[PDB]
A paper describes a structure:
The α‐subunit provides the N‐terminal dimerization domain, the middle peptide‐substrate–binding (PSB) domain, and the C‐terminal catalytic (CAT) domain. The PSB domain of the α‐subunit binds proline‐rich peptides, but its function with respect to the prolyl hydroxylation mechanism is unknown.
An extended mode of binding of proline‐rich peptides (PPII, polyproline type‐II, conformation) to the PSB‐I domain has previously been reported for the PPG‐PPG‐PPG and P9 peptides. Crystal structures now show that peptides with the motif PxGP (PPG‐PRG‐PPG, PPG‐PAG‐PPG) (where x, at Y‐position 5, is not a proline) bind to the PSB‐I domain differently, more deeply, in the peptide‐binding groove. The latter mode of binding has previously been reported for structures of the PSB‐II domain complexed with these PxGP‐peptides. Calorimetric binding studies show that the affinities of these peptides are lower for PSB‐I than for PSB‐II, with, respectively, K D values of about 70 μM for PSB‐I and 20 μM for PSB‐II.
Residue numbers in the entry:
A (entry chain A): 143 to 244
B (entry chain E): 3 to 8
Write the structure that this text describes.
């Protein structure tokens, strides 16, 4: 008995709903790793990255959260929340660089 | 502030 990429994503959603943001990351990244090894599956990466980027933000990994938000926005440029997240991160980053210029 | 899935 074993876990498909779909299973891993579902387990990631269980972790997320209990605010286990590290386990969210572990399961979601495992879902992506199974896809990348050529597992055939029907889950969408956009939804995976939506959970993953938020979970990584919860861990205080702002750079990696930004990375993941940009990967999401490459696949779904429409995505409303990722667009809002991007604006937030760019705001924070613009603030940091404003500080170093003063 | 950032917004995750509901
Ligand atoms: Mg609960």
């Amino acid at each position: 008995s074993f876990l498909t990429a779909e299973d891993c994503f579902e387990l990631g959603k269980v972790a997320y709903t209990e605010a286990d943001y590290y386990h969210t990351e572990l399961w979601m990244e495992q879902a992506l790793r199974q896809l990348d090894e050529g597992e055939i599956s029907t889950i969408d990466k956009v939804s995976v990255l939506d959970y993953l980027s938020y979970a990584v933000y919860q861990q205080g990994d702002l750079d990696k959260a930004l990375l993941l938000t940009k990967k999401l926005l490459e696949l779904d440029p429409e995505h409303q929340r990722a667009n809002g997240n991007l604006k937030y991160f760019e705001y924070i980053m613009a603030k940091e660089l404003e500080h170093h210029h003063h | 502030g950032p917004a995750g899935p509901p």
